[PDB]
Write a protein that binds this ligand. Structure first.
Ligand SMILES: C[C@@H]1O[C@@H](O)[C@H](O)[C@H](O)[C@H]1O[C@H]1O[C@H](CO)[C@@H](O)[C@H](O[C@H]2O[C@H](C)[C@H](O)C[C@H]2O)[C@@H]1O[C@H]1O[C@H](CO)[C@H](O)[C@H](O)[C@H]1O
Lengths: 212, 211
């Protein structure tokens, strides 16, 4: 049907103003689309924020406002607080369906950025004995909580067989994620170097090991 | 205050049907819409449909009309969603939200998780992850269903622990946990992860041994 598009991630510091936009593939958003904004905080905590383009939901701070800026719906946070770090979704009433955008991850820097601690573990003997091999890459203590993870087996990009978790908030409010490369013990034996490459804030961290 | 209470976790087999429910508290059920939202692992949010208990007007997403039945009982102030002919693609957290004119959800329920799987209760195989401060880990592989609990040295090692969320690989979950300890400390100080899987009363301890 129609596609609703939002920025994927935005970053701001405490006390600044930040604007998030939401647009439609049919051209303009209008009042009849009743633009809604909701906030997703960890552990599936959702809060309604703005309904009908600009109405604050019950008990939402006055620093949150919704408006149509031109042909787009927009949410502005004036004087962003560390607790506003969350995912924001907009949805539009269109053709009698609520259609959702993909959400914006807003980082509000309430502490200094931290680079990831990457650790790559080789398969254990006991697992190789079952004819399986799983490499484990743990990525902890990064802030902003947005990272990309890439695996290379003897320099070739891996496109199948890896799994990565979505970043979870640590209790110290930095983030953590893990990635798994699973291969059969046979296949693991045809290759020597294994790399887990994590890019965070335009910098790559690589941890590599050699079967041997 | 306003509360939207939802039913718990459901485990269903492919082909089945489930009924989930949401109770209203703090407001006049009849004056408001009850909407249902689906959230996939990472596929965003999708609106399933809405019912107005006051006159039982329903709206449905076209994509879901064939398998969903939305109902509401005013006497009980409860809304129901029945899903039919389930496939693994219906595994999601479902939310019921309170709506009105121009909005679908100012107050949200807590979410009910549905997993659709033909897998059987399988205990984890636990493997030690040694390097050879030092980070040690345990891989908890191939269990069904969720959850497993992981502790380190019977709870005595609580600082420096990270237990990651489970991924599904084939139709079983895999999860890992790590602990970082001062280098001097290991191997003199024994490090063991303790993994419990209640559904199959699996409890297994794995001592980390240098490679
Ligand atoms: C509550 C009302 O009950 C009957 O009158 C009839 O079944 C209506 O269809 C029903 O709800 C429509 O009318 C009210 C008018 O106040 C709107 O508030 C409703 O829209 C809200 O709820 C839906 C599910 C969405 O979340 C959007 C919300 O605004 C609903 O509006 C829809 O139907 C009317 C039909 O007359 C019209 O086409 C609206 O544009 C459409 O949104």
């Amino acid at each position: 049907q129609a596609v609703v598009t939002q920025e994927s991630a935005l970053t701001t510091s405490p006390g600044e103003t930040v604007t998030l936009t939401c647009r439609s593939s049919t051209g303009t958003v209008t009042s009849g689309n009743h633009a809604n904004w909701v906030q997703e905080k960890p552990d599936h905590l959702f809060t309604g924020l703005i309904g009908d383009t600009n109405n604050r939901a019950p008990g939402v701070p006055a620093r949150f406002s919704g408006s149509l800026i031109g042909d787009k719906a927009a949410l502005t946070i004036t004087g962003a607080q560390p607790e506003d770090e969350a995912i924001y979704f907009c949805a539009l009433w269109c053709n009698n369906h609520w259609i959702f955008g993909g959400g914006t991850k807003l980082t509000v820097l309430g502490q200094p950025k931290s680079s990831p601690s990457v650790t790559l573990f080789p398969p254990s003997s006991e697992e190789l004995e079952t004819n399986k091999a799983t490499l484990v890459c743990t990525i902890t203590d990064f802030y902003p909580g947005v990272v990309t993870v890439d695996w290379k087996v003897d320099g070739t990009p891996v496109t199948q067989g890896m799994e990565t978790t979505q970043p979870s908030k640590q209790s110290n409010n930095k983030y953590m994620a893990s990635s798994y490369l699973t291969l059969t013990a046979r296949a693991w034996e045809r290759h020597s170097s294994y790399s887990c490459q994590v890019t965070h804030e335009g910098h790559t961290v690589e941890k590599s090991l050699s079967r041997a | 205050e306003v509360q939207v209470q939802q039913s718990g976790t459901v485990l269903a087999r492919p082909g089945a049907s489930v009924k989930m429910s949401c109770k209203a508290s703090g407001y006049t059920f009849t004056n408001y819409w009850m909407h249902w939202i689906k959230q996939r692992p990472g596929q965003g949010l999708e609106w399933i449909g809405a019912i107005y208990p006051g006159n039982s007007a329903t709206f449905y997403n076209h994509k879901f009309r064939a398998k969903t039945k939305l109902t509401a009982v005013t006497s009980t102030i409860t809304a129901y969603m029945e899903l039919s002919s389930l496939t693994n693609e219906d595994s999601a957290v479902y939310y019921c939200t309170r709506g009105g004119h121009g909005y679908y959800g100012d107050y949200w329920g807590q979410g009910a998780s549905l997993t659709v799987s033909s897998a059987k209760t399988t205990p984890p195989s636990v493997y030690p992850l040694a390097p050879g401060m030092v980070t040690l880990g345990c891989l908890v592989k191939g269990y069904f269903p969720e959850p497993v609990t992981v502790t380190w040295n019977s709870g005595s090692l609580s600082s420096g622990v990270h237990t990651f969320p489970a991924v599904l690989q084939s139709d079983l979950y895999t999860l890992s946990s790590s602990v970082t300890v001062p280098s001097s400390t290991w191997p003199s100080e024994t490090v063991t992860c303790n993994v419990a899987h209640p559904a199959s009363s699996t409890k297994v301890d794995k001592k980390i041994v240098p490679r």
